[PDB]
């Protein structure tokens, strides 16, 4: 009559939760070479990444530098929101203008600007030249490295040192070969492209193609700019932030909450989907159950982020006693999301690349990388050297009531270049695909697990 674990309710202990260390991938019939495996996967319904890895929206993980590096690597990055709205929109704009391409509308400064401002802009956008346009948008000059290399007074106005108009310019729709001929004939490096009135429209240089050679795996929109995501909360400040990010050209908005099974989060997701659904994709916050994922799918989210207290010694488990083992959580959420074609992003609990392979095989479409990327060079922070080791050194916007920082009453080690970590994770994933006979990530999502005991984990 009684439940074996106590009581009379058979649903009091709803399930047995499996974590990553509880399962292994069973080898299957395979003709898949690890090198030839296709690791591309859907981040959302409309967005497909070459590498199914997304950097977590953590203040110590993803800023514009990390987002650019992740986009160039074939994945994507989500910009953290622990900063002012203006700063986050600026990071979005930096990522979008890192590899503009197409129109490549050039960053322009007013003649009333100063050399310090143009130096800051050059450092921000990784460029060595700025056209100068007046109040009406008409060209008035251009500034480059040769114009200000040794200038002493950084207060020198742009009009004082810019190359005065007229200049060597081309018209809108000028052919690429004609632009190359002009560049070779006049030996100028940055050729402005003007409209039919005198107002600047673009700038022609082959380096955008050159960077395409440098990073063939970059994930981009149709406009040829790098894809980027941004985290938002819930509320009116969150709505203002989301509108600003959409204006800046963000591609994915993620309603980032610790507990997405909440009417506020669902209403925010529905509002964003109705307002800016055609332009950007909306991803719902962290869930750990089938019902929460179903609620997010009903709210119209384009992808569902999964994980609530996934780590074993997670702060949420210790302080709140709340959590869900990640493999079981992913299985439960996929059972709700897959019939509607909604991708699942596994966030949290990863320690090795084998865990990434298991998370994808459990049914998730992408893995969100957090603490594994926190110490890399591309992550925000500055390198310092203490003792014999290198570390990384460096609220109003921490508005989540269930976030772990509300629980904790209170250095980040260096992890090396991002490329090495991404390469190792991809190699592990490709080896898993070869072992399981999975040519694609969709096939890998059909792979079977074997459950292991405690003796299988002992060193």
Ligand X SMILES: Nc1ncnc2c1ncn2[C@@H]1O[C@H](COP(=O)(O)OP(=O)(O)OP(=O)(O)O)[C@@H](O)[C@H]1O
Residue 72 binds: one of ligand X, a second copy, Mg ion, none (C-beta under 5 to 8 A by kind)? none
What does the per-residue mask of binding to ligand X show for 167-206, with x meaning CB under 6 A? xx-------------------xxxxx----------x-x-
Query: Is 340 annotated for ligand binding?
Result: no
Query: Is 365 annotated for ligand binding?
Result: no
User: In this structure, what token pair is assigned to residue 35?
Assistant: 């090198």
What is the C-alpha separation between 415 and 373, in angstroms, rounded? 8
Q: Which is nearer to Mg ion, 128 or 451 (CB)?
A: 128
Task: Report whether 333 contacts 349 (CB < 8 A).
Answer: no
What does the per-residue mask of binding to ligand X show for 67-106, with x meaning CB under 6 A? ------------------------------x--x---x-x
What is the C-alpha separation between 261 and 264, in angstroms, rounded? 9
Task: Tell me if 458 contacts a second copy by CB under 8 A.
Answer: yes
- Residues ≥6 apart with Cβ < 8 Å to 185: none
Query: Is 237 annotated for ligand binding?
Result: no
Task: Report whether 41 contacts 360 (CB < 8 A).
Answer: yes
Minimum CB–partner distance for residue 62 and a second copy (Å): 21
Task: Tell me if 233 contacts ligand X by CB under 6 A.
Answer: no
User: In this structure, what token pair is assigned to residue 136?
Assistant: 């009406």
Task: Report whether 428 contacts 285 (CB < 8 A).
Answer: no
- Residues ≥6 apart with Cβ < 8 Å to 40: 48, 49, 50, 51, 52, 440, 441
Minimum CB–partner distance for residue 131 and ligand X (Å): 7
Which range, of 201-209, 240-248, 298-306, 451-459, touches a second copy by CB under 8 A? 451-459
- Identify the active-site residue in 271, 314, 337, 430: 314
Chain-centroid distance, C-alpha 58: 10
The partner residues of 287 in beta bridges, in order of sequence, read 306
Task: Tell me if 389 contacts a second copy by CB under 8 A.
Answer: yes
What does the per-residue mask of binding to a second copy show for 49-88, with x meaning CB under 8 A? ----------------------------------------
Query: Is 107 annotated for ligand binding?
Result: yes
Distance from first CA to last CA of the chain, Å, rounded?
Answer: 40
Query: Is 147 annotated for ligand binding?
Result: yes
**Residue 122: active-site member:** no
Query: Is 144 annotated for ligand binding?
Result: yes
Interface residue with a second copy among 316, 365, 366, 438 (CB under 8 A) is 316
Nearest CA among 402, 286, 379, 343 for reference residue 52: 343
Site for a second copy in 392-421 (CB under 8 A): 401-402, 406-407, 409-410, 413-417, 420
Interface residue with ligand X among 87, 134, 147, 404 (CB under 6 A) is 147
Site for Mg ion in 117-156 (CB under 5 A): 128
Interface residue with a second copy among 53, 73, 327, 374 (CB under 8 A) is 327
What is the C-alpha separation between 137 and 344, in angstroms, rounded? 45
Q: Which is nearer to Mg ion, 128 or 448 (CB)?
A: 128
Q: Which is nearer to a second copy, 179 or 402 (CB)?
A: 402
Q: Which is nearer to a second copy, 93 or 256 (CB)?
A: 256
| 396-404: Cβ within 8 A, 24+ apart | 397/81, 397/82, 397/83, 397/84, 398/82, 399/233, 399/235, 399/237, 400/233, 400/256, 400/257, 400/258, 402/257, 402/258, 402/259, 403/258, 404/258, 404/314, 404/315, 404/316
What is the C-alpha separation between 266 and 260, in angstroms, rounded? 7
What is the C-alpha separation between 97 and 414, in angstroms, rounded? 28
| Alpha-carbon separation of residue 419 from 203, 226, 318, 339, 408 (angstroms) | 31, 17, 34, 35, 32
Residue 459 binds: one of ligand X, Mg ion, a second copy, none (C-beta under 5 to 8 A by kind)? a second copy
| Alpha-carbon separation of residue 63 from 57, 285, 423 (angstroms) | 8, 19, 20
Annotated binding-site ranges: 56, 97, 107, 128-129, 144-147, 163, 168, 189-190, 205, 207-208, 211, 256-258, 307-309, 311-312, 314, 347-349, 370-371, 394-396, 410, 459
Site residues, ligand X (CB under 6 A): 97, 100, 104, 106-107, 127-130, 142, 144-147, 163, 167-168, 188-192, 203, 205, 207-208
Annotated binding-site ranges for GTP: 97, 107, 128-129, 190, 207-208, 211
For the annotated catalytic residues, the residue numbers are 314, 395
Annotated binding-site ranges for K(+): 309, 311, 314, 459
Annotated binding-site ranges for NAD(+): 256-258, 307-309
Site residues, Mg ion (CB under 5 A): 128
């Amino acid at each position: 009559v009684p439940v074996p674990t106590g009581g009379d309710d058979p649903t009091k202990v709803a399930m047995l939760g499996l974590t990553f260390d509880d399962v292994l991938l069973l080898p299957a019939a395979s003709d898949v070479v690890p090198a030839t495996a296709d690791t591309s996967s859907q981040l959302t319904k409309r967005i497909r990444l070459r590498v199914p890895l997304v950097s977590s929206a953590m203040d110590t993980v993803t800023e514009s530098r990390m987002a650019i590096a992740m986009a160039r690597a074939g994945g994507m990055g989500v910009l953290h929101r622990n900063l002012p709205v203006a700063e986050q929109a600026g990071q979005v704009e930096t990522v979008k203008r890192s590899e503009a391409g197409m129109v490549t509308d050039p960053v322009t400064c007013s003649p009333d600007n100063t050399l310090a401002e143009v130096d800051a802009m050059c450092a921000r956008f990784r460029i060595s030249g700025l056209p100068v346009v007046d109040d009406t948008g008409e060209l008035v000059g251009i500034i480059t490295n040769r114009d200000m290399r040794f200038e002493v007074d950084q207060s020198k106005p742009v009009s004082e040192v810019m190359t005065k108009a007229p200049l060597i310019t081309a018209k809108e729709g000028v052919s690429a070969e004609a632009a190359l001929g002009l560049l070779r004939r006049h030996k100028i490096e940055k050729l402005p492209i003007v409209d039919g009135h005198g107002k600047l429209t673009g700038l022609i240089t082959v380096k955008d193609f050159v960077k395409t050679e440098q990073f063939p795996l970059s994930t981009k929109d149709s406009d040829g700019r790098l894809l980027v995501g941004a985290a938002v909360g819930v509320g009116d400040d969150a709505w203002t932030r989301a509108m600003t990010l959409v204006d800046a050209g963000v591609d994915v908005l993620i309603v980032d909450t610790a507990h997405a099974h909440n009417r506020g989060v669902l209403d925010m997701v529905s509002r964003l989907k109705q307002a800016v659904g055609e332009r950007v994709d909306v991803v719902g916050g962290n869930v750990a159950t089938r019902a929460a994922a179903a609620a997010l799918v009903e709210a119209g989210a384009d992808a569902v982020k999964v994980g609530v207290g996934p780590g074993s010694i997670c702060t949420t488990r210790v302080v709140a006693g709340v959590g869900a083992p990640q493999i079981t959580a992913i299985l439960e959420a996929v059972a709700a999301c897959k019939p509607y074609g909604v991708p699942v992003i596994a966030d949290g609990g990863l320690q090795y690349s084998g865990d990434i392979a298991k998370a994808l095989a459990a049914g998730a479409s992408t893995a969100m990388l957090g603490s594994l990327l926190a110490g890399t060079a591309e992550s925000p922070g500055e390198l310092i050297f203490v003792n014999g080791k290198q570390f990384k050194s460096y609220r109003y916007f921490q508005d989540d009531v269930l976030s772990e920082d509300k629980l904790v009453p209170e250095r980040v080690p260096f992890r090396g270049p991002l490329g090495t970590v991404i390469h190792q994770l991809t190699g592990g994933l490709r080896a898993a695909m070869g072992y399981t006979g999975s040519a694609t990530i969709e096939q890998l999502q059909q792979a079977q697990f074997v459950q292991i005991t405690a003796a299988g984990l002992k060193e």
